Structure formats: structure tokens, C-alpha cells
Amino acid sequence: SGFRKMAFPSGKVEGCMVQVTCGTTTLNGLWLDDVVYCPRHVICTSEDMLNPNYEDLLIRKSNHNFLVQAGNVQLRVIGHSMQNCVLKLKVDTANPKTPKYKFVRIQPGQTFSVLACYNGSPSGVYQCAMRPNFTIKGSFLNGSCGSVGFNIDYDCVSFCYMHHMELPTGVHAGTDLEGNFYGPFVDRQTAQAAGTDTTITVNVLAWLYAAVINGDRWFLNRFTTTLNDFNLVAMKYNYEPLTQDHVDILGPLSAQTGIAVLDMCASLKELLQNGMNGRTILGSALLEDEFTPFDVVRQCSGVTF
Amino acid sequence: SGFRKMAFPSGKVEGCMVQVTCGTTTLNGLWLDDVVYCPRHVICTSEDMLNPNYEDLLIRKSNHNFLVQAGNVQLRVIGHSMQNCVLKLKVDTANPKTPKYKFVRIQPGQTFSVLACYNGSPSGVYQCAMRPNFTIKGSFLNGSCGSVGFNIDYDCVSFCYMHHMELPTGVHAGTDLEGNFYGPFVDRQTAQAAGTDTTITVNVLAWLYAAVINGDRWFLNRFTTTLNDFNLVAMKYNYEPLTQDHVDILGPLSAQTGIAVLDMCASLKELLQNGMNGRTILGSALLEDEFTPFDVVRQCSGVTF
Ligand SMILES: *[C@](O)(C(=O)NC1CC1)[C@H](CCC)NC(=O)[C@@H]1[C@H]2CCC[C@H]2CN1C(=O)[C@@H](NC(=O)[C@@H](NC(=O)c1cnccn1)C1CCCCC1)C(C)(C)C
Ligand SMILES: *[C@](O)(C(=O)NC1CC1)[C@H](CCC)NC(=O)[C@@H]1[C@H]2CCC[C@H]2CN1C(=O)[C@@H](NC(=O)[C@@H](NC(=O)c1cnccn1)C1CCCCC1)C(C)(C)C
Ligand SMILES: [Cl-]
């Protein structure tokens, strides 16, 4: 028993991390096969960032403008192209340490592991959620750009995130591995609102099921509710609407605990209306929303990779 | 910016994990050189666990009673010995994937990364603290025994923890890699009190410095305090005494923020006496005590491995 914010084991991703330098800018890239993926703003000067013409800037770069480094093996770049907001550097060596992998785009409310890197070297690994407003609450310092987010399913690394930038609120924005931003953001230095964040309701319910699996069940009540009447209370507390598809994805946890999803909804309704009255759930004084139903099942059933 | 419970990158440890079977019992071992370390209770039956005579039980085992498995490479055991509460299986193959490493014993309040494993395969990685009462608040299911805790310093894995057992409160107990339990526990199935847990004061202060580094500084006040008068208030809230050595280890964070350790103590004093008045610090409604001063520096300075 116990319940922790648990990341995926990171070894497979560790062996794909490299250092990419262009001019004065050094950040991280992802070395899969003979390709290094990194944020396209590696090519920019401080002055270029106000409204970069990335097509023109890249046209003025040659292969030898890009220094790629795998620890010491100084990779030779033989090609460069741009896909959306990511640069792809063809190199003369295909990464031996290349794991099996896909590139996927996660949905708001889904979770992933971030391998935070500096200079192509891992600092640490942590879990987080894609927020409904398509930001993530990461831990990223200058030089962290090109750090990636990923999930592992069987033996296959699904890359879902590459880090590009920090908003003035201290939250983080980036792209999938085809270089499309999550959310409304563009890679230029302008004020860009993230828009209203909401609480990931399906995930709060998942974590309440986690609490029950772990014998912490004080918040269970005799009341029940319809999905509609639940959503009327939840919308008042800036919670995301709960959909039938969310109710379906909570089924496993419902089945395991014998608590119907709408009875857990009735529990969350009272927590929202009353607060916790200085009690805690799985050590927390706040309702936690960065565990998916699958995270709870993974962790409470000991799924391995 | 941002501040997350961050684990060490786990790849180096991943390649040391193996499956150890003795009779009906399968758990994890740590494969370093030609030695596999695992909990000695792998040799026990359900009935043996009331008061096992581990010397006599081990004497009745032969090398071929122990099935060691690295994925599929079925390791042949050529020796078995006992050191305190850990079994050492000499094998015919030394692990190629063997990283550089030490075995260390951490102090109460220090943190480490746990690589949770089942059947010699990683499930996930998370951070936790050795509690003052020498338990850890882990996430461990049946089959997790032999999962290890570790830190990385330069390129050297310091192993500090091997998982043995769960207390009826849902907290966890284990040994260092010389097989000595943390805390008063013995590997037999008897009621064993953990004793009073306390809040890791030096770590709360470290996390308040983290909050200031991240622009969350509402709790800073004009008041100050002596170390003694701080400890008079803190002892009332079941906080660990703060020592001059703790004050010294907070020096870096004091220097970086220009807030004297005793001025941060004066901030914590009011938080304890008043509570947070429904405010939060780095997203939390509770005071967090599972970051060390070095964790805050590591994470706020982007130290890599
Ligand atoms: C990353 O590339 C990296 O690690 N580089 C290695 C060090 C050499 C780097 C890491 C910063 C922590 N990312 C960036 O430099 C990005 C790029 C891409 C987009 C613009 C530039 C600057 N940048 C940022 O992350 C910045 N953030 C902003 O500029 C915000 N701007 C504003 O909020 C704003 C407000 N008023 C006027 C003008 N801008 C972002 C910009 C993008 C939309 C969201 C808001 C800093 C300031 C470096 C965090
Ligand atoms: C671990 O070996 C493993 O992963 N084994 C693989 C599955 C085959 C296994 C994992 C359990 C989650 N650990 C254990 O089996 C340990 C060993 C070592 C010490 C005794 C046995 C049983 N065990 C436990 O972790 C148990 N915990 C207890 O028995 C507690 N006992 C009591 O609190 C108690 C209360 N009243 C009367 C008698 N006992 C522990 C025992 C040690 C001191 C602290 C309290 C279970 C119940 C399996 C969690
Ligand atoms: Cl909290």
C-alpha cells in the first residue's frame, strides 16, 4: 500500500539525450535513429525572438552551424529540416541506445514523466499532468529546453512532450514530437494568455478511488447524484465537466472497490461544498488532480516495464 | 522555475534489477558484480515468519534452491551467505550493466529515490524521506521486496535502502545494503511499534527557501527568533529539534535568498502558530518536509548526473 506521484523508469530515455548548440544557444535534443529533435528556437538570437521568421533564419544556417554532442562522441550533422516548431538534425551515427518508441499527442488531463536535462545530461524525473489549459506545472531551469515527456506501454516509449518555454506565472509550454504546441502558444517572446485552468475532475475521482484502495474512506457518504447534477456543482468550483467517457474510464476502479462512479461523485460533491474540515486524504489537505484512472490502476496493481 | 518532487534518473539502477525465487517466494534482487543482494526472508515459509531461526533455515538451503533471473539469462548461483538481514547470492556471471556504486546508510530526514520493482522489472520511481522514526511512506505492493533506494553523486550510485516489509499503518521498513534495519524493526511477523513520527524541520525550512526562490514569499515576516525560542515552539508541534548543523546546511539557501536561517525560522514559527489561513505554498496547503536543503539546491541549480 501507499500512494506516491510515481514516474516511469527513465533509463530508455536517458540514452536518447544529447546536447545541441547553435551559435551561443545550448539546449537538449532527443537522439532517435540518426535524427536529433530539438526546439527550433535553438537557431534564434535574443533579438530574433520578438517575431522570428524561422524559415529565413533556418535557410541562413548550414549543417556545421549545429554542434550535437552525445557525452563526448561529437556527432556530425549531415542534414537539417524543420517540422512545425521542432528542428530535425540528420547525423552520421544512428543511436545504438535507441529504444522502441512512438510519437503521440496526449489530451488535457493525461499524465506523463518528464526527464529534466541540462547539456544533454539528466538532472531528474517527475510526473505531471497536461493541464486543461495546455500548460504543465513543471520544474525547468534555463537550459532545460528540449527535455521530453513520455509514457512507457509494454517496452515502447511514447514521447508526448518537448519543453520550449516558461510563462510569467511559472508554468511551462511545449510541443508534441511533431513540433505542434499544446495550447494557443507560439515560439516568440510576446505576452500570450494561457486561459482559465480548471481542475481535472476524472483525475480527482481516480485519486479518491486510490484513497479507498489505501483504507482512507472517511469521505464516502450515503448520498448519490446524477452526472448532470454533479456537473452543476463541479462547474461552480472550476472543475472540468465529467463526461460519460470519463465515467467509463473509471469503471475498473469502480469494479475493484465496489463504489459506483456516481456514488464517488456524490462524495466529491460534499467535499467541494463543505471542504475537508481540516482532514486529509492520502496525506493531502487539497484534492489532487494529477493522477489518471490508469495511473491509479498501474500503481495499485504493480504494472511493470 | 517550478518545484516538483524529483527522483534521480533511474537507468543505472534499472540494469542491476533481477528476480530471485526460493521455494514459493519470488522477490527482487540487486545484481552488482557477480553478487545478488535480496531480503533474507526469501528463504522463509509463512509458518517460519513467526520467529525464524535464519541461520538454521539458510543451512538447510543449497545454491540450486535459489533461482536468479536477469530478464531471461537464468543466472546460476555458485554461493550463498547472509549479512545481517540480507542474503548474498554469488553467481557465475558478473553484471555487465554494473554501474559505479557505494553502499551508504542515510540519516533520518535524508531523501532518496526508490525504484519500485516486481519480478525484477521496474514499475516506477519516486522520492521519499527516511522519517525521523526510520519508516518511509512508500508505494509498495506484494512482490516489491528487494526494491532499492538510492542517490546519485557525480556518476556513482549510493544505495541506501532495500525494501523488506509494511507496517499496519501502511508505512514501510527496510535495511541498508549491509542488511541492517533502519529503526527498531526485526524481520519476523510480530507487532512492532514505529514510535512517534516528527516533522523534519530542516526540510520544511529548505522548502520555504524553495518557495522564495520561486517568488512565493507571503509568509516572510519582520519578526526574528533565537534557535532556542524557535525550538520551544517547534517541539509543541511535534517538529524535530533544529540544530546548529541544520542551520549550517541551510547556509547556501540563506546566502542565495539573503534571508537569514533564523528569519526563516521566525516565518515558520508564525505559520505553525497561525496556520496558513487557507493560503498555499508551492501549491501545498500543508508544510512539506521531504525536501533536503541539497534537494532544493540540486533542483533550483540544475545539477546533472
Ligand atoms: C530554452 O530554449 C532553453 O533552455 N534554452 C537554452 C538556455 C539556452 C529556454 C528556457 C527558458 C527558461 N526557452 C526560451 O528561451 C523561450 C523561447 C521560446 C519562446 C520565446 C523564447 C524565450 N523563452 C522563454 O521561455 C521566456 N518566456 C517568455 O518570454 C514568455 N513571455 C512573456 O510572457 C512576455 C510577456 N510580455 C512581453 C513579452 N513576453 C513566454 C513567451 C512564449 C509565450 C508564453 C510567454 C523566458 C522569459 C526565458 C522564460
Ligand atoms: C516482501 O517479501 C515481498 O515482496 N515478497 C514477495 C511477495 C513474495 C513482502 C511484501 C509484503 C507487502 N514482505 C514481507 O513478507 C514481510 C516479511 C518480513 C517481516 C515479516 C514478513 C511479512 N511481511 C510484511 O511486510 C507483513 N507485515 C507484517 O507482518 C507486520 N506485522 C504486524 O504489524 C503484526 C501485527 N500483529 C501481529 C503480528 N504482526 C510488520 C512485520 C514486521 C515488523 C513491522 C510490522 C505484511 C502483512 C505482509 C505487510
Ligand atoms: Cl496539501
Side-chain angles (χ1 to χ4, degrees), chain A residues 1-153 155-305, chain B residues 1-153 155-305:
Chain A
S1 65
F3 202 75
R4 278 282 184 184
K5 216 155 260 169
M6 191 169 298
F8 289 96
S10 73
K12 283 178 182 52
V13 182
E14 292 172 55
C16 303
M17 297 308 302
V18 302
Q19 180 170 39
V20 176
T21 293
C22 182
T24 167
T25 302
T26 293
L27 45 65
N28 309 280
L30 191 65
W31 181 20
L32 302 177
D33 301 328
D34 53 336
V35 175
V36 176
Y37 302 80
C38 74
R40 77 173 168 174
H41 72 256
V42 74
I43 71 176
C44 293
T45 75
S46 58
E47 326 199 331
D48 291 323
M49 288 311 314
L50 307 183
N51 196 1
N53 183 315
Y54 281 101
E55 294 78 356
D56 291 356
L57 295 176
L58 185 57
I59 287 162
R60 301 196 336 235
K61 291 293 164 187
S62 319
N63 290 331
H64 62 269
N65 294 137
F66 300 105
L67 294 153
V68 187
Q69 203 174 151
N72 192 22
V73 29
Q74 189 64 22
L75 289 192
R76 162 186 151 197
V77 179
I78 62 176
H80 59 277
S81 55
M82 183 158 62
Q83 179 181 6
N84 302 310
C85 301
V86 294
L87 211 63
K88 314 196 286 192
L89 309 174
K90 195 79 55 158
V91 278
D92 68 0
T93 316
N95 196 7
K97 278 152 145 36
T98 299
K100 179 181 198 177
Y101 76 81
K102 318 212 318 300
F103 291 170
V104 314
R105 189 169 175 98
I106 53 160
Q107 295 289 338
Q110 301 199 282
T111 59
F112 54 99
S113 302
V114 169
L115 185 70
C117 301
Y118 303 88
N119 295 104
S121 295
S123 186
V125 59
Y126 58 84
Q127 274 300 94
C128 59
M130 182 59 64
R131 302 298 319 157
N133 74 355
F134 287 107
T135 61
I136 70 176
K137 302 186 173 152
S139 174
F140 288 117
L141 303 169
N142 197 251
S144 58
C145 293
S147 300
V148 294
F150 67 89
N151 286 288
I152 319 196
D153 334 44
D155 63 304
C156 178
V157 189
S158 287
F159 299 99
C160 55
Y161 181 81
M162 181 172 274
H163 185 50
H164 292 238
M165 56 214 200
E166 184 172 300
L167 319 205
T169 45
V171 306
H172 297 113
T175 68
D176 64 22
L177 269 291
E178 299 182 314
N180 293 124
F181 270 89
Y182 291 95
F185 313 105
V186 290
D187 46 0
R188 64 178 287 211
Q189 187 153 49
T190 55
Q192 297 176 43
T196 299
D197 203 26
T198 49
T199 303
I200 308 156
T201 312
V202 65
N203 285 187
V204 173
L205 290 166
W207 169 87
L208 293 177
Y209 278 103
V212 175
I213 297 186
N214 283 277
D216 200 355
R217 67 153 58 221
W218 63 260
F219 49 81
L220 298 183
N221 63 30
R222 64 171 189 286
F223 312 146
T224 200
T225 184
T226 76
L227 185 58
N228 182 76
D229 286 340
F230 174 69
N231 282 326
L232 285 191
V233 163
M235 138 197 69
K236 202 199 147 188
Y237 289 99
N238 293 325
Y239 273 56
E240 275 304 280
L242 194 71
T243 70
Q244 179 64 44
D245 293 336
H246 298 326
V247 168
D248 287 344
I249 274 81
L250 289 159
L253 290 171
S254 188
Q256 194 201 335
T257 56
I259 297 164
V261 170
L262 284 181
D263 293 342
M264 194 60 87
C265 287
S267 286
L268 181 49
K269 187 172 149 145
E270 296 303 297
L271 285 175
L272 290 179
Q273 272 163 172
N274 299 154
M276 282 193 204
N277 302 285
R279 297 223 252 189
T280 74
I281 300 179
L282 284 175
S284 182
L286 305 177
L287 300 169
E288 177 66 45
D289 78 341
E290 298 212 354
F291 299 91
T292 69
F294 187 44
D295 296 343
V296 174
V297 164
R298 196 250 293 201
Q299 176 168 171
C300 294
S301 88
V303 168
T304 59
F305 308 100
Chain B
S1 65
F3 202 75
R4 278 282 184 184
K5 216 155 260 169
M6 191 169 298
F8 289 96
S10 73
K12 283 178 182 52
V13 182
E14 292 172 55
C16 303
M17 297 308 302
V18 302
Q19 180 170 39
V20 176
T21 293
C22 182
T24 167
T25 302
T26 293
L27 45 65
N28 309 280
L30 191 65
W31 181 20
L32 302 177
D33 301 328
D34 53 336
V35 175
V36 176
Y37 302 80
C38 74
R40 77 173 168 174
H41 72 256
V42 74
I43 71 176
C44 293
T45 75
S46 58
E47 326 199 331
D48 291 323
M49 288 311 314
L50 307 183
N51 196 1
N53 183 315
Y54 281 101
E55 294 78 356
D56 291 356
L57 295 176
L58 185 57
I59 287 162
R60 301 196 336 235
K61 291 293 164 187
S62 319
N63 290 331
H64 62 269
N65 294 137
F66 300 105
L67 294 153
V68 187
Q69 203 174 151
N72 192 22
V73 29
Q74 189 64 22
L75 289 192
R76 162 186 151 197
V77 179
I78 62 176
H80 59 277
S81 55
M82 183 158 62
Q83 179 181 6
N84 302 310
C85 301
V86 294
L87 211 63
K88 314 196 286 192
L89 309 174
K90 195 79 55 158
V91 278
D92 68 0
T93 316
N95 196 7
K97 278 152 145 36
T98 299
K100 179 181 198 177
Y101 76 81
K102 318 212 318 300
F103 291 170
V104 314
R105 189 169 175 98
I106 53 160
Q107 295 289 338
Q110 301 199 282
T111 59
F112 54 99
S113 302
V114 169
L115 185 70
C117 301
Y118 303 88
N119 295 104
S121 295
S123 186
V125 59
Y126 58 84
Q127 274 300 94
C128 59
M130 182 59 64
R131 302 298 319 157
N133 74 355
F134 287 107
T135 61
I136 70 176
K137 302 186 173 152
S139 174
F140 288 117
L141 303 169
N142 197 251
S144 58
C145 293
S147 300
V148 294
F150 67 89
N151 286 288
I152 319 196
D153 334 44
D155 63 304
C156 178
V157 189
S158 287
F159 299 99
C160 55
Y161 181 81
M162 181 172 274
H163 185 50
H164 292 238
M165 56 214 200
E166 184 172 300
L167 319 205
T169 45
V171 306
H172 297 113
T175 68
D176 64 22
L177 269 291
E178 299 182 314
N180 293 124
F181 270 89
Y182 291 95
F185 313 105
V186 290
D187 46 0
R188 64 178 287 211
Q189 187 153 49
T190 55
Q192 297 176 43
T196 299
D197 203 26
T198 49
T199 303
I200 308 156
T201 312
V202 65
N203 285 187
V204 173
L205 290 166
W207 169 87
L208 293 177
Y209 278 103
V212 175
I213 297 186
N214 283 277
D216 200 355
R217 67 153 58 221
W218 63 260
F219 49 81
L220 298 183
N221 63 30
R222 64 171 189 286
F223 312 146
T224 200
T225 184
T226 76
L227 185 58
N228 182 76
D229 286 340
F230 174 69
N231 282 326
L232 285 191
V233 163
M235 138 197 69
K236 202 199 147 188
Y237 289 99
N238 293 325
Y239 273 56
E240 275 304 280
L242 194 71
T243 70
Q244 179 64 44
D245 293 336
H246 298 326
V247 168
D248 287 344
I249 274 81
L250 289 159
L253 290 171
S254 188
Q256 194 201 335
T257 56
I259 297 164
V261 170
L262 284 181
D263 293 342
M264 194 60 87
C265 287
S267 286
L268 181 49
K269 187 172 149 145
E270 296 303 297
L271 285 175
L272 290 179
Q273 272 163 172
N274 299 154
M276 282 193 204
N277 302 285
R279 297 223 252 189
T280 74
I281 300 179
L282 284 175
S284 182
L286 305 177
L287 300 169
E288 177 66 45
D289 78 341
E290 298 212 354
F291 299 91
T292 69
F294 187 44
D295 296 343
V296 174
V297 164
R298 196 250 293 201
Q299 176 168 171
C300 294
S301 88
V303 168
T304 59
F305 308 100

